[PDB]
Amino acid sequence: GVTEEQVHHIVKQALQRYSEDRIGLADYALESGGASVISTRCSETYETKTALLSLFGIPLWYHSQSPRVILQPDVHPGNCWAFQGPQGFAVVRLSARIRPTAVTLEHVPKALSPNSTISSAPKDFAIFGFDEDLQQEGTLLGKFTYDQDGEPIQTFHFQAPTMATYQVVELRILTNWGHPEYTCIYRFRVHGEPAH
Amino acid sequence: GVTEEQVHHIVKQALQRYSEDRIGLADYALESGGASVISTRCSETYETKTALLSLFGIPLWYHSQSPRVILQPDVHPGNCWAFQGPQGFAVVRLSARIRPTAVTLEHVPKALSPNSTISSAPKDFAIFGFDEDLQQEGTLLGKFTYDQDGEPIQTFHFQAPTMATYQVVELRILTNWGHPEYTCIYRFRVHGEPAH
């Protein structure tokens, strides 16, 4: 038996957690906080030549999603960086040098996707740390799989992370969930502990 | 008597529903998902010449809301397409051809509106399907009334929808809730079943 008052408090706490970027963890990869995509290696943007901007009927411009969007909070359907194939890369300079402890990856939920499936979602992926530049050899921090049957937002704690700190990390997508032309990345976050 | 654990679960489910575009239904009219406003017929935008952009005191540009905003998720006060009169039209090419089953219309809530009233909200409206182009004769899919005393977001299931599928639909606003100069449309969504 729970009182009305306890219900209120439980609701209050859940909404405060909801309002703290859903998961309550600072994101060192958030663009507005000072992070950016610095390279995509040889990732080939999947360009469809479909979203056409025009005025008085004059074709002006084809819009497509920048890699930058993976560090942007708006994750409505279609607001994702799409690359060709199931193999892609994004190198991110974090907003502060940290010891990384977890990353988060999300995708649009099935309920909002057509046919209720998300085969364009990343599946297996890995995270690498770069101690200085992005040309030296990456150190693997973790390998993980984004689960298409889990929550749209999934957090991934490194098992036995070292004490090394990094300001450059790379998200590598290895496979996807079956989509034959592309892979969509909605948002990638990186969490950890700053220099203390 | 409910346990703490059941409360948590109920809260969890309600927040997951909240996060799925509030109502948990894919929206085939969402612009970022591949839909667009293709015509407004003879709808006359209500232009006020009021929102003036300037630099070093130099008048540059009067901002006004595009029809496109009705397919955009941001619905803060004023982020609505306004037309003159209580009669207006918007033709939308959906992002996929579907059998339509429901539409949703929302407006700013009364609590956030001045005087706590929303007389600029649409009242009676109807939805038409176009089997191909937008010039042939529309087929009526439903007539409905947006209720000014209901929730800000209202979903409207068609009674006895046919099995016909469409990629072009038109929202027609017939009356409003009393506002003498214009009608504000915040967001219009269309739900249904894709080709299977």
Binding site: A51, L53, S54, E181 | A35, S95, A96
Partner: peptide, 25 residues
């Protein structure tokens, strides 16, 4: 006359159209 109109088409509001199928999502 009404049906033939498209004021959106004659404005300073850029129009968006999906000419070649859905965007990626």
């Amino acid at each position: 006359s009404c049906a033939l109109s498209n004021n959106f088409a004659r404005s300073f509001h850029p129009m968006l159209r999906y000419t070649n199928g859905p965007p990626p999502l």
